[PDB]
Amino acid sequence: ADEEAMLAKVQASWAQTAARDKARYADERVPEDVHWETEYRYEQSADPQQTLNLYYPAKRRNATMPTVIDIHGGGWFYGDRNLNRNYCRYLASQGYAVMGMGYRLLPDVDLRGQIQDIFASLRWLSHFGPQRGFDLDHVLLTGDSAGGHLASLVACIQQSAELQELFGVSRVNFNFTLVALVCPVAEPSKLPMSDMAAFYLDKLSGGDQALVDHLNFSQVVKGLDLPPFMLIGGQNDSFYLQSQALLKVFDANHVTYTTKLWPASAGPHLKHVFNVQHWEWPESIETNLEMLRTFDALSKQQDQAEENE
Numbered sequence: 001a002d003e004e005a006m007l008a009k010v011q012a013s014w015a016q017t018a019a020r021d022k023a024r025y026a027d028e029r030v031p032e033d034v035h036w037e038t039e040y041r042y043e044q045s046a047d048p049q050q051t052l053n054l055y056y057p058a059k060r061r062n063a064t065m066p067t068v069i070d071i072h073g074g075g076w077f078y079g080d081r082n083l084n085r086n087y088c089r090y091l092a093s094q095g096y097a098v099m100g101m102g103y104r105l106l107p108d109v110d111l112r113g114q115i116q117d118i119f120a121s122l123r124w125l126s127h128f129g130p131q132r133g134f135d136l137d138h139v140l141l142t143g144d145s146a147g148g149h150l151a152s153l154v155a156c157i158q159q160s161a162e163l164q165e166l167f168g169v170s171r172v173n174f175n176f177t178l179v180a181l182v183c184p185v186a187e188p189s190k191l192p193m194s195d196m197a198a199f200y201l202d203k204l205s206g207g208d209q210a211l212v213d214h215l216n217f218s219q220v221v222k223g224l225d226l227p228p229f230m231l232i233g234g235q236n237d238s239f240y241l242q243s244q245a246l247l248k249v250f251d252a253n254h255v256t257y258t259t260k261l262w263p264a265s266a267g268p269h270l271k272h273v274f275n276v277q278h279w280e281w282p283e284s285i286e287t288n289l290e291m292l293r294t295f296d297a298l299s300k301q302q303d304q305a306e307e308n309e
């Protein structure tokens with residue numbers, strides 16, 4: 001029938017999203033009291049996607065601040081380091097040093113190339129973050145939608161020499177204190193618009209059977225000792241099914257987790273990734289603070305455990 005036409009279809013849909021995102025950002029309040037440093041190349045490459053932004057409170061109470069690392073969403077086909085800027089700014093305004101990266105998009109790369117990009121940005125941060133204010137002893141890793149998928153896999157790969165080898169990455173010299181997933185699509189194989197879902201999975205695996213067998217969080221969680229997770233979302237998330245599926249995997253694997261899941265009664269506006277797309281809404285503030293407090297409580301328990309209070 002056609003590969004070119006399915007692609008053109010998929011891309012039409014992302015052009016639509018891009019227009020809504022542009023219109024929202026033109027309108028929306030911007031968080032105050034933040035500085036950003038933009039467009040750092042994280043490897044020797046002129047690919048514009050292999051860059052990252054850093055965000056900080058305008059007034060730093062300390063030389064180093066606990067770290068947040070954000071992986072944006074967009075269905076693996078869409079987005080860049082700027083997409084989640086308001087969300088990153090909001091988190092930074094609360095007293096955190098924040099990094100958000102670009103990663104090359106499907107179909108130009110497959111999942112391995114995206115995982116490599118993300119690992120390159122993490123390694124860059126391990127080299128250059130602390131000198132400019134990042135406390136890498138307390139690190140919150142977060143991602144929304146496809147970015148939540150990517151965050152969930154990166155958490156497992158960081159812990160596993162076997163997956164490091166399969167994905168062609170090396171572990172980075174810091175740990176994740178918490179991994180917070182916002183409306184993640186962490187089980188993309190369960191998505192099947194069936195031909196379109198199949199097209200995505202094909203583009204993610206790039207035909208590599210090792211990626212097919214390692215495309216879902218359920219396939220990479222096995223046997224690893226992981227940090228705590230936080231699952232964020234709601235019953236009016238278009239992908240709430242994926243959240244329900246993921247809880248079953250957490251329970252079966254003895255993952256430590258907490259949840260902040262909004263009931264349908266909390267309203268029709270609490271849609272897909274609302275707390276990233278609308279930082280200023282009261283429910284977004286509540287959710288995002290609750291995540292930062294959860295991260296702080298874990299960071300305090302680690303400090304106590306390490307005789308460093």
Ligand SMILES: *[P@](=O)(CCC)OC[C@@H](COCCCC)OCCCC
Binds near residue numbers: 017073191272
């Ligand atoms: P996330 O990255 C939300 C991005 C808007 O979700 C992954 C989805 C894409 O969302 C629907 C497409 C139009 C917004 O995974 C692919 C769905 C197609 C079968």
